Write a protein that binds this ligand. Structure first.
Ligand SMILES: Nc1ncnc2c1ncn2[C@@H]1O[C@H](COP(=O)(O)OP(=O)(O)NP(=O)(O)O)[C@@H](O)[C@H]1O
Ligand SMILES: [Mn+2]
Ligand SMILES: [Zn+2]
Lengths: 151, 346, 283, 173, 312, 285
């Protein structure tokens, strides 16, 4: 069932290893990798998601310094402490969510463009949290093992 | 084939004692008209060539140089075509009346289902039937297998209890007893069928061919001979660590290079540490000496060359194995590229 | 005559089971289960008959002659046994369910594929209108289910959606409106598409590593590590016992088979891996 | 009684039209019913011309042409070159026998005489490249057979057997 | 007319002789025949039709006293028909169509012909898509140790069908058909089970092509043996010639007769047919009549479903 | 009687215990606990047997032949063991509680679900037939509890409302206020419905981050960091010990099994995990 997720990680990730440079918030990503996973199933998906969006800088910088990844190239994501190194992770999860038709782009792109629809974007993620948590599990453990090996 | 089987009959008649040789004599005389057939058929194909094909009436020719590569290929073609039908050497025998009408010689036990099948062959009926290991002498003697108590030990030495044998596989056992009868065939045309039997019955030599038990137990033997007496004093009694009595040698190089090293390599592991009455005593003995108890497994390693037939035919499937299929030669016009490349390189 | 009557029965696992097969597969397990042609867990008829015969010889030592007659004789085995077991085929395996819907709480569920039900119907059709014992309702249920092959069907439920074995989302749909349950354990059955059903099933099996510890220095001995595969507790198999007409076959069916709930199948019994409850399809 | 027609099936989409109107005749013998392309037939000794789409024979049972038997008259503007013969239906060598034998058979066969000019390198080829094969559905299997996609939600298995049940040795030249 | 034998589970048609723990220091093994010999089907059907007051000698006497001319077995999966095909050591299942060009294929010249037959047995073969050997290792357990007995271990390569498989025979008499309908039988060795369903059919018989497919082991009368094994090219185009045993008789508990035979799937050249009739004595003709009643000399041709006996 | 003696017993955790899982399953925890078919924690009787046998071979160094007979020889076996261990079912796990209206509150309570009780009833019914041991008390008490299946209940105490493990509000019904303790402890037993019980029990488990530190520079060594799952103190498992008639089994069932009270299970015992107490059901009912 899950055998293209390992293929999806390459062109979803696209860079959370190299252009995450300076080795602080670069190596720190592995803490995301392990902890969040144990966080995502011991504590739930929505608690971890609220935590991740908390660390998001959702102005337009951490709203477009990521939606630029949909289109162009590797995005050196220096910015500041893990808020741009954290909005790439929000991007990771939402990239899985769009490339697997759990939530479509036309909503996502529209949900992150008014701040009126961020709320019901999250309110809809809340209803999809069981299914989402079940489905991303292997797709996440993929990048967790990527981190163990490479990052 | 018949020279070998008759030389075997005479060598066995030279030994009417020893039980096993006597049983071999006793059943050979009952199975000659069945043992007439060779147990191994051969296929023979020839190909002709004449001066019409080689010479312009005084010299060589042009395309005469290729005449071999053509006749060889004709020969191999007929070989391939005849290999489309496999006949088995057992189909040659006449057994319908011998099985339908009980005619088979059943020296040994008697089947309660017509005839038995050979345990060594699988397809041919059994001639020599051995009782199961529950009480042999009290049966081996009232039956026709053995004559005394001394001869059972020599029959039981080659034919394990329960081993049914067809005439062919029984002849195989006979040859395995002393494999020096092979000079009836190995030389041929050179000495008589009786010169050799005299030579063999004169200089008696016994050979130890290793069983799978001997191969499985190689490292066990090897680890007992680096504790020559340090393990022997423990047993000192069961002939494992006792004298080499005769001068038995063998073709197994490891057996041959490790015989005069304290431990008797001609014991049967199925008797000592693969047995069901022993091997707990032997587990203790090996535990008390840092001896890794043997595994019951061996490696059967087979290997065949790749496309050596095509190679003798000068094909390129040896050179490009998988790229150029053999079927690709039927119309090689397709794969011009790889053949062009490698042939030109060469 | 010549397999007149038959007894189909369910093999309900009371503990885990391990009917072994050597190392007979290409998986990473070193002591796999006995496998069907479809890679599903099966119980060979040899094993089932041997275990049941051994158990019955122990717990009916006076009926030894009846049991010998029905199931065979150690020596003088020139008397064909007038009873036979078919291979036990996996009928349903428990699966962990994270359900999203139905307002009804469930934490585990029974799971099947359509291949399994196909073989069960094969066993079942080959008895009823041929033999005389009549339990056509079970066959009608299995046919009604097999009608819907090619889509995850829930049975006797209102689920409509679930996570199965923590790893697979599936969308379910009731059969028609309602149907008698094929099992009597009050737990939903799900029949799954033969492709996701087998992923769910091969994730429902228990594959453990095991260890031999150095008895003195409390560490693992070198190479003292292997894997084994147990069919989970509550798993259900299905088999049939076919009886040839005879007198002591009636004794078998009357005195013996009516006092067989629990037997021990498979191996690794010191681990406790063999207890089984036999439910005859006769209630 | 009716009359049938053995239309060829090459790599080519020269099989979009063989008959004037959709179905026409009363009954058909070749069937597409839930588990196979039943009662297909394979003519031997012939070959197909993928371009210039007709038959281009090559006489050996090694060569063969696989065609379906439909009830229609050939285009009303030819059969100067199309065979029209009649056999007792038991010389009709049908693959995957399922249905009813009619015993009074009449066939039309798309074919052109060999007209030998080229060295006929006659090479076999699969029925694959799904982009080629999928658009064939409702113009070779629903232009004469409206019966499918009427009751059939079983198209991809009678596609599985499409992937193999046609085979030939084309012209290529 | 047609009798479909539907196995309910893997089957075992033992190919060899002894299968029992005779020697102590050795395991025993067995391998199943892909197609059950016609003696198996015959003895099964007879078991279904047994009488307690006939024969007792030369089993085929009172066996044929219950049967019709059974016509050899092939494989039907889902209405599809597969047919054996045999080479030197090889055995492949193929369907009706792939047999057409086979006479001309074996007379194609060297490389074309070898490529053809080699693709017939490694690309066209549908055996390993429908039938695979399921190795079943079994043991016996001594009730004193609750462990294995000494080396009382055996392998048995069973016959596992990946999809629905029937075995197809044709039977002449119809009073036999409606008395073995829906019978659960002990079809094969080591106690496996199969079901019998009967459906009346229609296939023609009288056909004489150049070649033939042997849907059953052609028995050679042991007086034509040397007259057969000197000129093998005259009668079989490809296949296997083997010593076989006719099975094992149940009423008398004996092993049946060993005869040379041409295994099924071998292609025989029509020269075979009269070659048998002209080289057999009436007293052996009477025996081989029954040998054909049970189904041993059955020929299909590569063109149509051409059922044909040899003597009859 | 297929079995000579049937010894059902409880396994009261004294410290936190950690029996590790053998599995190629990639989980979140680096070293999870052993799981049954419902995801609940369990002890594979492989581990019970290995540990109890390694303990007995030392506590009773003279009776090593009785033990080798009932639990099998070690290095050169000639025979099947005569004693069988059943897998340990979770039976009750402790969970922190906050109550609303009590007289004298509790701060932790025993949590069981109906599925665990059903597995226990399966064990009891299966063993009542393979032995002469009829456990009427356990069986009838567990049947009375199972009668109320599908409704969270407090067995004895009167709580009517609680917050288990700081997260899960639960309403509760008294069973009848007329049923003794399954085990004579001082804490109430909460039989939960299964869906909420799964979450409560997962909260009662103890995940623990651990590290390795460079002795030189008192900083975490690279790679030295992992998580690790424990089962709390006071956790109660359930299992049965079963043996066949041997005259080494009558001894085992009368000398060895009356001097087993404390054993070390699982691993991580250098850090105190594993000490556990056996409470033979025949005594504690
Ligand atoms: N031209 C030849 N001369 C002598 N021996 C041959 C010749 N061709 C084949 N053999 C031997 O006869 C047997 C033929 O088996 P085969 O496997 O077809 O040979 P091959 O060329 O090695 N094909 P393969 O092994 O599959 O690559 C083998 O034992 C070959 O070593
Ligand atoms: Mn080679
Ligand atoms: Zn032999």
């Amino acid at each position: 069932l899950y055998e293209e997720d390992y293929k999806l990680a390459l062109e979803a990730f696209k860079k959370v290893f190299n252009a995450l440079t300076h080795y602080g918030a670069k190596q720190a990503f592995r803490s995301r990798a392990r902890d969040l996973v144990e966080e995502i199933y011991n504590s739930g998906f929505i608690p971890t998601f609220f935590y991740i969006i908390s660390k998001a800088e959702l102005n337009s910088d951490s709203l477009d310094s990521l939606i630029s990844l949909f289109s162009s190239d590797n995005a050196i994501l220096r910015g500041s402490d893990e808020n741009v190194s954290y909005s790439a992770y929000l991007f990771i999860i939402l990239y899985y969510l769009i490339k697997r038709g759990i939530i479509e782009q036309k909503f996502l792109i529209q949900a992150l463009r008014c701040e009126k629809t961020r709320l019901d974007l999250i309110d809809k993620l809340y209803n999809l949290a069981p299914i989402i948590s079940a489905k991303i599990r292997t797709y996440l453990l993929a990048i967790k093992r990527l981190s163990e090996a490479l990052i | 084939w018949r020279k070998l089987i008759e030389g075997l009959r005479c060598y066995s008649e030279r030994k009417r004692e020893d039980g096993f040789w006597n049983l071999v004599c006793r059943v050979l005389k009952l199975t000659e008209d069945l043992l007439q057939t060779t147990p191994l058929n051969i296929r023979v194909k020839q190909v002709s060539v004449t001066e019409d094909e080689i010479f312009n009436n005084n010299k060589l020719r042009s395309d005469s140089w290729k005449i071999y590569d053509n006749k060889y290929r004709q020969l191999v073609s007929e070989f391939k075509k005849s290999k489309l039908v496999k006949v088995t050497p057992e189909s040659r025998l006449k057994l319908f009346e011998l099985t339908k009408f009980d005619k088979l010689p059943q020296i040994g036990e008697k089947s309660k289902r017509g005839y038995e099948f050979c345990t060594s062959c699988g397809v041919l009926p059994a001639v020599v039937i051995m009782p199961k290991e529950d009480e042999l002498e009290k049966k081996l003697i009232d039956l026709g297998i053995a004559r005394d108590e001394k001869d059972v030990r020599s029959i039981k030495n080659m034919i394990s209890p329960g081993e049914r044998l067809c005439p062919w596989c029984l002849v195989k056992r006979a040859l395995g007893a002393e494999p020096r009868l092979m000079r009836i065939l190995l030389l041929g045309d050179l000495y008589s069928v009786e010169k050799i039997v005299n030579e063999i019955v004169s200089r008696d030599v016994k050979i130890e061919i290793p069983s799978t038990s001997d191969i499985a137990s190689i490292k066990t033997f090897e680890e007992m001979i680096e504790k020559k007496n340090e393990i022997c004093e423990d047993l000192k009694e069961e002939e494992v660590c006792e004298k080499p009595s005769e001068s038995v040698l063998s073709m197994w190089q490891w057996f041959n290079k490790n015989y005069y090293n304290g431990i008797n390599l001609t014991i049967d592991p199925e008797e000592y540490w693969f047995s069901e009455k022993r091997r707990r005593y032997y587990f203790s003995v090996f535990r008390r000496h840092r001896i890794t108890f043997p595994s019951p497994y061996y490696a059967l390693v087979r290997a065949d060359s790749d496309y050596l037939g095509d190679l003798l035919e000068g094909k390129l499937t040896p050179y490009l194995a998988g790229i150029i299929d053999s079927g690709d030669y039927a119309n090689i016009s397709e794969k011009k590229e790889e053949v062009n490349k490698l042939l030109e390189e060469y | 005559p010549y397999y007149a009557f038959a007894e189909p029965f369910f093999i309900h696992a009371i503990t885990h089971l391990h009917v072994g097969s050597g190392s007979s597969v290409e998986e990473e397990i070193a002591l796999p289960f006995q496998r069907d042609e479809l890679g599903y867990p099966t119980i060979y008829a040899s094993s089932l008959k041997g275990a049941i015969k051994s158990f019955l010889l122990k717990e009916f030592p006076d009926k030894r002659d009846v049991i010998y007659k029905v199931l065979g004789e150690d020596e003088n085995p020139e008397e064909a046994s007038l009873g036979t077991f078919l291979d036990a085929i996996l009928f349903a395996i428990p699966s962990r369910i994270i359900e999203i819907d139905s307002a009804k709480p469930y934490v585990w569920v029974y799971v099947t594929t359509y291949e399994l039900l196909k073989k069960v119907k094969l066993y079942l059709d080959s008895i009823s209108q041929l033999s005389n014992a009549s339990f056509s309702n079970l066959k009608n249920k299995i046919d009604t289910i097999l009608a819907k092959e090619g889509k995850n069907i829930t049975l006797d439920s209102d689920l409509k959606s679930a996570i199965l074995n923590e790893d697979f989302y599936v969308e379910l749909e009731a059969l028609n409106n309602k149907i008698p349950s094929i099992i009597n354990a009050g737990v939903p059955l799900l029949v799954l598409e033969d492709s996701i059903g087998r992923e769910v099933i091969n994730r429902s099996l228990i594959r453990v590593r095991r260890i031999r510890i150095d008895r003195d220095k409390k560490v693992v001995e070198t190479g003292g590590l292997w894997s084994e595969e147990y069919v989970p507790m509550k798993t259900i198999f299905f088999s049939v016992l076919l009886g040839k007409e005879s007198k002591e076959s009636a004794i078998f069916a009357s005195c013996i088979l009516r006092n067989l709930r629990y037997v021990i199948l498979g191996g690794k019994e010191t681990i406790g891996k063999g207890i089984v409850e036999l439910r005859w399809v006769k209630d | 009684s009716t009359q049938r027609e053995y239309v060829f099936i090459p790599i080519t989409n020269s099989i979009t039209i063989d008959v004037k109107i959709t179905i026409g005749g009363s009954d058909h013998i070749t069937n597409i019913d839930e588990r196979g392309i039943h009662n297909v037939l394979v003519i031997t000794g012939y070959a197909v011309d993928e371009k210039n789409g007709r038959l281009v024979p090559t006489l050996d049972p090694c060569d063969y042409v696989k065609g379906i038997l439909v009830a229609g008259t050939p285009q009303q503007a030819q059969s100067n070159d199309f065979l029209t013969l009649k056999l007792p239906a038991n010389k009709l060598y049908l693959i995957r026998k399922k249905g009813n034998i009619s015993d009074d058979l009449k066939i039309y066969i798309p074919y052109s005489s060999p007209d030998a000019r080229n060295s006929m390198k006659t090479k076999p080829v699969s029925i694959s490249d799904d982009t080629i094969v999928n658009n064939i559905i409702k113009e070779v299997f629903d232009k004469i057979y409206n019966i499918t996609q009427k009751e059939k939600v079983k198209i991809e298995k009678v596609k599985e057997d499409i992937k193999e049940l046609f085979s030939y040795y084309a012209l290529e030249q | 007319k047609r009798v479909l034998i539907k196995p309910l589970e893997p089957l075992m048609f033992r190919s060899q002789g002894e299968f029992e723990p005779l020697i102590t220091g050795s395991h025993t093994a067995a391998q199943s025949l892909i197609i059950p010999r016609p003696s198996t089907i015959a003895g099964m059907l007879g078991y279904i039709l047994f009488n307690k007051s006939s024969g007792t000698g030369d089993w085929l006497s009172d066996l044929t006293n219950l049967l019709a001319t059974i016509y050899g077995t092939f494989i039907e999966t889902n209405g599809e028909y597969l047919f054996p095909l045999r080479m030197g050591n090889h055995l492949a299942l193929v369907d009706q169509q792939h047999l057409i060009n086979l006479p001309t294929l074996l007379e194609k010249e060297y490389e074309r012909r070898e490529k053809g037959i080699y693709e017939l047995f490694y690309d066209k073969n549908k055996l390993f898509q429908i039938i695979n050997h399921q190795d079943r290792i079994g043991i016996s357990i001594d009730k004193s140790t609750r462990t294995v007995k000494e080396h009382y271990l055996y392998s048995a390569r069973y016959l596992a069908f990946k999809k629905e498989v029937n075995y197809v025979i044709f039977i002449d008499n119809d009073a036999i058909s409606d008395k073995i309908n829906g019978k659960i039988v002990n079809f094969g060795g080591e106690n496996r089970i199969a079901k019998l369903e009967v459906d009346d059919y229609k296939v023609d018989t009288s056909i004489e092509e150049e070649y033939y497919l042997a849907l059953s082991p052609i028995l050679i009368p042991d007086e034509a043996l040397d007259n057969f094994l000197d000129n093998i090219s005259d009668y079989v185009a490809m296949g296997k010639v083997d010593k076989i045993s006719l099975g094992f008789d149940i009423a008398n508990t004996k092993r049946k007769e060993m005869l040379t035979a041409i295994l099924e799937g071998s292609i025989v050249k029509r020269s075979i047919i009269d070659f048998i009739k002209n080289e057999i004595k009436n007293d052996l003709r009477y025996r081989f009549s029954k040998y054909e009643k049970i189904g041993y000399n059955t020929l299909m041709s590569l063109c149509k479903l051409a059922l044909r006996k040899i003597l009859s």
